[PDB]
Description:
By secondary structure, this protein is mainly beta. The chain contains one helix and twelve strands, in the order ββββββββαββββ. It has one domain (3-234): Coagulation Factor XIII, Chain A, domain 1 (Distorted Sandwich). The longest helix is centred in the middle third of the chain and has 7 residues, at 114-120. It binds copper (II) ion. Copper (II) ion binds next to loops. It is classed as oxidoreductase.
Amino acid sequence: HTLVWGVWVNGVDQGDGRNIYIRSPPNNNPVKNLTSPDMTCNVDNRVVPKSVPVNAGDTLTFEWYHNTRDDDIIASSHHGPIAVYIAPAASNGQGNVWVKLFEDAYNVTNSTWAVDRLITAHGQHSVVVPHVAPGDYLFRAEIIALHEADSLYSQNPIRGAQFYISCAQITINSSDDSTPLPAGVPFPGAYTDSTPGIQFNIYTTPATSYVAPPPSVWSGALGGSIAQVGDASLE
Ligand SMILES: [Cu+2]
């Protein structure tokens, strides 16, 4: 149970974005139904009044929280991967539009899941803004909690993989468009009951064997991190 509070651009806090530049859902409950319209941008997908200005090559940092800013972030039980997708905003996230910029699942070197490192990072994970066409975009940040993912939601709706999905409105101003954005995958639709990484038993299956759900990270993606960029306590 986690939500995005706001974003940072090059380590500068853009301030509370809830219902302002984030398409915030009403609460931190997960999405679990893979065929739900709620898979796109969570349960309250609508245009919000602001879009955060960035340039290509900026560091864009998402900041998550549980109940209050810079708290426990997400229950430690919620081991799983983190992904970020991008789509042109005029799509409203509909159709074959979502392109993956970032994936971090289980780090063998560190013996930690992305969610474990997100807590350590005070809820902060980042991407490099890609060199796509200038214009308005949705950045879809997706945490998958796998602590109840041994079941399919479609078999037992009390369990299943848990999707924490947050869509930020981002406007890319300066971009040379060296990597034009291709078509991508649909949400809902890209994840199904047979997709690798959706049904996974963290109690019995080693995390070293986990394969995160496709699609693969786009060739145009410039990277990211799970690391504290900004100290919310200094504000
Ligand atoms: Cu939860």
